[PDB]
């Protein structure tokens, strides 16, 4: 029921008197909770929307030099003072080169040459800063019970479902109560302030590649750093690190810009988690929250409904779904309406004793049609056994 098919699915059994249960709301995991008087509800924190991520100091990812020139003075003939050397848009490097009688100077010695060029960053990766009031974790809850095989993955429609529904928990709204129809109301007490280190990380974007890099790694990137939202002439903080003015043996200081650092940024982005960006709300699909499951409002729906009449036909007979739980897919052939599936899993058929606990406890057929497809779930002991679906 959207949580039993998870390979990292967590089975929750037993709470603190049914009032508060402490759970780990993982960004990639889903936890199925089974209670004494409540159905098994799978909660999966699948959505993670980061909204209003303000820009940070973003280094240049591929720069390039402009029209460069050199100002040369002789040895003891003054230092180089370029006219573009006083221009902030042109990066320049001064050096002591050889100037001689054959080199044009009036004395053989070390003249001064300064080479300048309009070093402009052709593209820069920009790291958005995520505030703590921008996170919103979307957790889908789904009561395991009266649903078919096409509702385990068929998540199209959560408000009009009444068996599954998604609730968004934010830092402003940590406490919530999702009214699951028939089952009562599941109480979410997730701590959005206690997040998975949202203030220690930045969301760097480069080539449409969202990456939740660390704050120290984002503040340690050695690129030409545009400061803020100044989208015009960038400041280029550490802009001199992209070019190298290699002086020759004579008066030729060739300023060569470095290559594209997006490959080295991908090489440094291996240890970070790649995040998605859905516009203003960046979609981070990983994390780990801490949820207070309120099972006081959670009731067992259809408990007063009687057992089904007959014609429980196990179509698509299931097996262990990677955890020992046996997903029973049945077709209730009968017009009992709100009937209850009287199924049992036991080895000894001459005794008829209960053999194992059921995942989808209280299996109740909901449809009033002739053949109603439903999915049940049971967890028997280690080995194989007999599954009697119905009486006779």
């Amino acid at each position, epitope marked *: 029921i959207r949580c039993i098919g998870v390979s990292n699915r967590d089975f929750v059994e037993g709470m603190s008197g049914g009032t508060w249960v402490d759970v780990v709301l993982e960004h990639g995991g889903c936890v199925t909770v089974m209670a004494q008087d409540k159905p098994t509800v799978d909660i999966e924190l699948v959505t993670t929307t980061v909204s209003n*991520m303000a*820009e940070v100091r*973003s280094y*240049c*990812y*591929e*720069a*390039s030099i*402009s029209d460069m020139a050199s100002d040369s003075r002789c040895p003891t003939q003054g230092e180089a003072y370029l006219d573009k050397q006083s221009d902030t*848009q042109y990066v320049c490097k001064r050096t002591l080169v050889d100037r001689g009688w054959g080199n044009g100077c009036g004395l053989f010695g070390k003249g001064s040459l300064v080479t300048c060029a309009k*070093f*402009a*960053c*052709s*593209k*820069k*990766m*920009t*790291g*958005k800063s995520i505030q703590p009031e921008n996170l919103e974790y979307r957790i889908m809850l789904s009561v395991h019970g009266s649903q078919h095989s096409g509702m385990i993955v068929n998540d199209t429609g959560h408000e009009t479902d009444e068996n599954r529904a998604k609730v968004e928990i934010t830092p402003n709204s940590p406490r919530a109560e999702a009214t699951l129809g028939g089952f009562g109301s599941l109480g979410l007490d997730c701590e959005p302030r206690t997040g998975l280190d949202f203030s220690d990380l930045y969301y*760097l*974007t*480069m080539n*449409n590649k969202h990456w939740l890099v660390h704050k120290e790694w984002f503040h340690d990137i050695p690129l*030409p750093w*545009h400061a803020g*939202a100044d*989208t*015009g*002439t*960038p400041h*280029w903080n550490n*802009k001199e690190a992209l070019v190298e003015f290699k002086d020759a043996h004579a008066k030729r200081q060739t300023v060569v810009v470095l290559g594209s650092q997006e490959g080295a940024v991908h090489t440094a982005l291996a240890g970070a988690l790649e995040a998605e*960006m*859905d*516009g*203003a*709300k960046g979609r981070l699909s990983s994390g780990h929250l801490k949820c207070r499951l309120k099972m006081d409002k959670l009731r067992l729906k259809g408990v007063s409904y009687s057992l089904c009449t007959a014609a429980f036909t196990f179509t698509k007979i299931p097996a262990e779904t990677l955890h020992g739980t046996v997903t029973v897919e049945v077709q209730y052939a009968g017009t009992d309406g709100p009937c209850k599936v009287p199924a049992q899993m036991a080895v000894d058929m001459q005794t008829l004793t209960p053999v194992g606990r059921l995942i989808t406890a209280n299996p109740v057929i909901t449809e009033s049609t002739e053949n109603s497809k439903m999915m049940l779930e049971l967890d028997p002991p280690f080995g194989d056994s007999y599954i009697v679906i119905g009486v006779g």
Partner: antibody
Amino acid sequence: QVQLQESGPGLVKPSQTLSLTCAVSGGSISSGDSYWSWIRQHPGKGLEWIGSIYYSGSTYYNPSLKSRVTIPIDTSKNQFSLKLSSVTAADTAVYYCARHVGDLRVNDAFDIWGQGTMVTVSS
Amino acid sequence: QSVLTQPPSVSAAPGQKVTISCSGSSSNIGNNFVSWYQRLPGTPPKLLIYDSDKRPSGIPDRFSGSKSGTSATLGITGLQTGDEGDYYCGTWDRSLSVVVFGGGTKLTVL
């Protein structure tokens, strides 16, 4: 790959306000190297830039189209807008919504082009 | 005054190198480096050349840019029928304060 697709009402009335929407694939308006520029490309004339919005939403445009052009941006939708109120025959042209040059590019650098939504302004 | 004088007629032999000259001014073409937009009949212009020398990623090696004064030069060495299109120069004007595209280059690889 980042792609831009300009679309909208290609036929407009005189004195009307044309609205072209540039949808973006492979990126968003809040990117680290994004500045979505709309350029008017009339038939028989070269491309002339009319509005260039930034990641913050506001931007600078041409002064000839300053009295009629607007550069809207959809932050939640990841789309750009080129609006022309009180249009005429001279305002009808190709309206591509390319993503502009990077950070140190104080001059323009139209590396990526939009879908090229042609505009017709007739009564 | 936002006009770039470009050669509007472009032909191309099989493997022939074509030359397109986009003439600007000292304020825009002489002021900075101008790129080109190569457009199809149903497509808008895509970037070829940046700063008048640095070709974009994915651009062909036969496309070669050059800058001399206010004149940008686009050479197409080994030009084919796929080199045909609308190659129009473009540059930002220091006096204009905005980017202006040129007159175009109707390349026709016959």
